[PDB]
Ligand binder design. Structure first.
Ligand code: HPX
Ligand code: HPX
Ligand code: HPX
Ligand code: HPX
Ligand code: FE
Ligand code: FE
Ligand code: FE
Ligand code: FE
Lengths: 326, 328, 325, 325
């Protein structure tokens, strides 16, 4: 078991030292619905996210990931996974303090990332006037910015990719669909519990840091929307890191930008390659053939930011780029 | 283990009968750019560049069109035995075989309406010769330079005299869940089912002519809306009959394009994957036949009653005669 | 000479018995900028329209086109064209009472359509905060709805297509790139004075009416935007007539919807086929073999409205569809 | 005056040391039709090119442009333009030795680029079975590779951009829609004689060479096709330089690759922004503030090739990239 115990990535919490600007980024540009406000946080969801929220913005001294929560495939699976972690000496705590959700098990990845598991999730129902004629779509697509449909995946930065990968595979039942190696060292791993290539990935922190967030990605499902989104970001002064293009690794149409708070956000295009074959061997990418893996087109990922910057960062984004530029 | 939700992995292949085998072959190679991996007797085997096994499509010469069979691959060898046993204990006649190139032990059976279905686990993983391998590691073969190449098989739609009976079989015997359905009063006239995050890999719609065990259509995946636009322009200028599309069905949020291959079978070109069912606990969405506009098409597309809701293969009348008959 | 006297379609005015709803349609869904408000009318422009406005919405008892103005290639061209019309005995009037524009020659088509020619047009300059980093783009693309870039073309419904075609060809110097005939009668003509396949089209009125507007089109330039637009119209209750698909005639990616006031509006995708060849013969389509001409894809153009409904209409859109169904 | 004398870019000839590989590139990947073969040359056309050919591939010791020919808007216009060049002391030669075309005037730009003017051009008619149901389309879109529709534009490298610019403006009547400057020095100019932002561009040669070709571009009109094309080139081992993305300058969706012979070829997506305004002022970009001009997206144009490599090149592409690091 453990194999089919995890259903999908339900939500993530981002910390931001410029909470209002981050909120404006997610509403004005990415068209997310705000469903709740309390204390230091604001809760949002894309029009096709199934629960009250998929994103939580929380004011903080620095940027980074407050947590990421995965929803299990049943309440039985939740008990199973939490039991596995506890039996494995992984410290965890049960709680039930989040709007729109129930009992949740909180724990740390081997590198310090805040992870959570839950089953109890309220099915979001929009106000009558905002319900879509498309029955599988809870809310009508907003008429603001270039609206994302839902959260897509999470990419964690780590001092030890294998340690994190092992935890997801062993305790959560994830399978690694693709990975990148240097010698016999894993510097990148993409993992999934369903037909998606991945919903959680882990890449080596080239600065020697640990427990950082590389990026949180949101789904468009249409390549043209990354083109529309980047033109928007360019004209409305949002820093563009790379893209739009497509990574050979995971066959993902990507667009990386930096929201006002300092976190890296990815806009994801076409779903791409779905893993229908139930027992496909993990594909291992090498340095010798990493060109296509990084980008099918002419896109070039900046060493001074993409492979080195993650949040929280001891240096500001500008300070960082200047330091690793050489 | 008694939990059967994950026993079926996906739709592996389908076989189409055609009274014009060569023209049908040309359709799938010249226009849809599929690779031919085997030839035997009166059949030709093909695969899209991203299909994982030796073939996902088999074209067989026959006096009439229709579906020879459809085979689903399980998630493990154990799942195959469990599903086969469920069917057997349910008094469903079944037969084991190992007849096909590129595959192993297979369980053959028929749906309540007579559709030829199959279950299997043993499948050879297709490996392209060095020269045809893609630099994209999850892609077995390079995308062909012929026509508008489809990536893989996507789903199948079966026409039936009793949708509810077919749905019940997939649900209780194969572990499928029904994501969406359409009812007319208190009668189910359409059901879309799945065992994974796809909205569906197998659908069933009521035969409005009174027939049964027919094939409504076999669908192939592009994943890009623009390719349905490119495809239809190609079909129009190269004399392939177009039924409807490109547009998008509200039901299953699928970008569709329906055309008729030379043999008479309806084939669908599928665009963006659309809406993935991430929520593992979502209730079936039920559409009313009386409030179906959005469900049929988000755009201005119109599905002809003279063919879309009445034509399936094999058909008592040839396509032309069928349309003329049901038009008035 | 003559051929190059008309530069492009500058603007159009739409009459609407539901002016507020019509304005909401163009701003909330089509993301057009409002540049001026005055009495019974509102002025708008797409973010890439060169002048203060390309669309004027005016409150009226019925729907329809108030007018359409074409800009000339020079001031000399304007005098030449106006003189040609006058010499042809076409009644015309000079004026200068519109915001953002100058001297204008007003006249009517052989079928009663209100047309105008002008040269003096102010070049819109957006406030600094709204200027685009793309220098050829006056304003940033709005963050509302699915923003149209600019006006594209006009399609006039007439009781005599050839009569209208002759006016544009002989007096304005337009060429007819494509046409549709039924026996010896022209029932459709698409005319241009530049690289575009057409900026003004004229189709036969099959109801015995005359001087009506079939539709006004706005440019996206991207096929996916018609897909996004129709999904928006569907979920936000705007009546969809046909599309998205592509007409073989003019090779245009189309999407036809009805705005609240009753006028037909087309959302236009890829520019399509540009007429680079300077002396290509007019392509003539036959009504007897028009399938590809109407739609490359599977789109079906409803006779109950597409070939029969135009504004102003004696019957409401609902009554019309019911009647011709 | 001469403002409308030139209609469009009719064709171009590319030299290649690997003629067969270059031919395969344009046929197997870009789906162009071969319409003629003579001596050491092959003639091709996109399915929507109006004449027998838009591209001529000629075997040669080095890469580069054999010539580029523009078609005038009339025979009178040809006489006028040639007259202007001759009166300006520009050496010219009249000839008529090209398949599918008639009398043409051959001359050189101030930097040595081989240019030509002509009016007589045969209208290509495809064999019965290859004619398209779309009447404005001469031949059916091929079922090979990702077929380009037609030639789009040319970009010339020059030791003196202003000199080349003056020639096109003064002698051909072209207008400069956009340009890039550094102080009082023009390092780039985009010119047109019609609604297109440009059909001919000129950029500074940073190596000190002259009369070279930066790139020849072909039209798709669809952004997705550049995405499709780049994936094809990547998996079929064609060197990719930059893109798919969009230049703020000229608002063009670009994809630059190197064909087997060494020439840079651009695949062009959406037509983009059409210059409908007849008297729009030239948009001048500053070299110091050109981020958006180079690319709206995150694309990065490599200095080691994009701004320095042109054909013919004294160094092989490999050696050139190595040299400029
Ligand atoms: O994350 C992806 O989907 C992707 O294609 C990027 C992979 C990047 C790397 O190979 C990488 C390697 C070491 C450290 C950081 C990043
Ligand atoms: O199959 C689909 O995705 C779809 O939108 C079509 C639904 C068609 C029907 O409702 C239907 C009803 C009765 C008989 C045949 C077809
Ligand atoms: O306007 C177009 O581009 C187009 O393809 C529409 C042509 C419609 C007609 O053939 C038509 C014929 C008679 C009366 C009205 C319209
Ligand atoms: O050609 C274009 O559309 C474009 O955006 C490229 C502009 C490149 C330059 O500014 C340039 C400047 C100096 C030397 C070569 C090239
Ligand atoms: Fe990612
Ligand atoms: Fe289907
Ligand atoms: Fe139109
Ligand atoms: Fe270019």
């Amino acid at each position: 078991d453990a194999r089919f115990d995890i259903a999908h990535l339900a939500r993530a919490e981002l910390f931001s030292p410029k909470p209002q600007e981050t909120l404006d980024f997610f509403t004005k540009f990415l068209g997310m619905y705000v469903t709740h406000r309390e204390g230091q946080s604001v809760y949002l969801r894309g029009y096709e996210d199934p629960y009250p929220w998929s994103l939580k913005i929380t004011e903080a001294p620095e940027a980074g990931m407050g947590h990421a929560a995965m929803r299990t495939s049943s309440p039985e699976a939740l008990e199973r996974r939490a039991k596995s972690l506890t039996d494995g000496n992984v410290d965890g705590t049960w709680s039930e303090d989040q709007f729109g959700y129930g009992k949740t098990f909180e724990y740390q990845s081997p590198d310090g990332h805040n992870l959570q598991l839950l089953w109890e999730a309220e099915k979001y129902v929009a106000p009558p006037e905002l319900r879509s004629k498309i029955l599988t779509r809870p809310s009508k697509k907003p008429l603001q910015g270039i609206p994302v449909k839902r959260i897509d995946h999470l990419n964690l930065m780590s001092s030890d990719v294998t340690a994190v990968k092992d935890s997801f595979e062993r305790h959560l039942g994830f399978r690694t669909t693709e990975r990148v190696v240097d010698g016999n060292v894993e510097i990148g791993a993409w993992m999934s519990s369903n037909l998606l290539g991945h919903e959680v990935a882990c890449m080596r922190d080239m600065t020697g840091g640990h427990g950082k967030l590389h990026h949180l990605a949101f789904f468009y499902g249409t390549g043209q929307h990354n083109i529309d989104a980047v033109e928007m970001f360019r004209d409305y002064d949002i820093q563009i890191e790379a893209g739009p293009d497509k990574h050979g690794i995971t066959q993902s149409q990507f667009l990386y930008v930096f929201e006002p708070g300092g976190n890296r956000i990815e806009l994801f295009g076409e779903a791409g390659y779905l893993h229908l074959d139930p027992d496909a061997e993990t594909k291992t990418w090498q340095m010798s053939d990493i060109d296509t893996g990084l980008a099918v087109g002419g896109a070039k990922l900046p060493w001074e930011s993409y492979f080195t910057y993650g949040t929280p960062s001891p240096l500001s984004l500008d300070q960082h780029i200047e330091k690793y530029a050489h």
